């Protein structure tokens, strides 16, 4: 398990339908990216929305 | 400093799943997720330890009242209550009289909060125990107090009193 991937089971538990960013990503626009992941890319924030596929909404890319 | 208290966790949530959630927010050192030994269930809360104070503080800012797991809103703080809606209070009915009327049914966690809709004097009353809250409903719903006929039921959060308040029982057992 990694930052940027969320399993279908957890997605179901979160009530997060596919093709949607997890609810905490909106707050990251205001407050900033994770202090422990300076190189985190999130689709639709600082990574092309085309990469939001399946379990993936982000990825640590330097 | 580097550990956060997580509250309001549906007991079906596993520890793997807590890890999977919180590693989205920052890298996680360990998780203490207490199990009630008698019931072999989890108790509604956990402790998540990050690597430093900064990541924890970040987590609290981002995660607090952002995520619903099994529909319930998760709380994140540094370092599960019976709330009733009372409608149609008389002008006479102080905050103090509410305390006296509901005291006899059980312990109150905080003082009442009074507010007005539409003319219509209402209050929130906060019980430690859903068992005690039930008695107060049974005894006072649709009854006459200071010549006004009141209603008493659980407040909206959609309502308090759901089954998954065995979290109330665990917290009473383990003394908050």
List all residues of chain B from 71 to 130 with a beta carbon under 8 Å from chain A.
71
Q: How far is B43 from chain A (nearest CA, A)?
A: 18
Question: Considering the domain B1-79 in this protein, what is its CATH number?
Answer: 3.30.70.330
Cβ-Cβ contacts under 8 Å for B36 (sequence gap 6 or more): B42, B43, B170, B173, B174
Q: Which has the closest alpha carbon to B73: A3, A14, A45?
A: A14
Q: Which has the closest alpha carbon to A14: B141, B6, B70, B96?
A: B70
SS3 content of chain A, % helix, strand, coil (to 5): 30, 20, 55
**Alpha-carbon separation of residue A53 from A33, A48, A61, B84 (angstroms):** 20, 11, 16, 44
- Please state the domain extents for chain B: 1-79, 80-176
Report the residue count for chain A. 62
3-class state of residue A49 by DSSP: helix
Residue B37, φ and ψ in degrees, nearest 5: -70, -35
Q: Which has the closest alpha carbon to B4: B42, B33, B24?
A: B33
Using the Cβ of B54 and the Cβ atoms of chain A, whether some distance falls under 8 Å is answered with: yes
Count how many pairs of residues, chain A against chain B, have C-beta atoms within 8 Å. Answer: 58
Instruction: DSSP for chain B, please give it.
Output: --EEEEE---TT--HHHHHHHHTTTS-EEEEE--EETTTTEE-S-EEEEESSHHHHHHHHHHHTTT-EETTEEPEEEE---EEEEEE---TT--HHHHHHHHHTTS-BSS--EEEEE--EEEEEEEES-HHHHHHHHHHHTTEEETTEEEEEEEPB--BTT-TTTTHHHHHHHTT-
């Amino acid at each position: 398990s990694r930052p940027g991937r969320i399993s279908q089971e957890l997605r179901a538990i979160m009530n997060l339908p596919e093709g949607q960013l997890p609810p905490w990503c909106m707050k990251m626009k205001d407050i900033g990216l994770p202090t422990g992941y300076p190189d985190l890319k999130i689709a639709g924030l600082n990574w092309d929305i085309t990469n939001l596929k399946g379990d993936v909404y982000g990825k640590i890319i330097p | 400093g580097n550990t956060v208290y997580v509250g309001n966790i549906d007991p079906r949530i596993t520890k793997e799943q807590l890890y999977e959630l919180f590693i989205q927010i920052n890298p996680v050192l360990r998780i203490k997720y207490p199990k009630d030994k008698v019931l072999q269930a989890y108790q509604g809360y956990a402790f998540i330890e990050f690597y430093n104070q900064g990541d924890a503080q970040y987590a609290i800012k981002i995660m607090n009242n952002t995520v619903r797991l099994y529909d319930r809103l998760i709380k994140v703080r540094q370092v599960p209550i019976a709330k009733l809606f009372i409608k149609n209070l008389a002008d006479s009915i102080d905050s103090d009289q509410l305390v006296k009327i509901f005291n006899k049914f059980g312990k109150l966690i905080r003082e009442p909060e009074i507010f007005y809709l539409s003319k219509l004097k209402c209050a929130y009353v906060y019980f430690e125990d859903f068992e005690k809250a039930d008695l107060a409903i049974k005894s006072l719903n649709n009854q006459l107090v200071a010549n006004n006929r009141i209603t008493v039921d659980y407040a909206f959060k959609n309502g308090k009193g759901n089954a998954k308040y065995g979290d109330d029982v665990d917290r009473l057992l383990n003394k908050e």
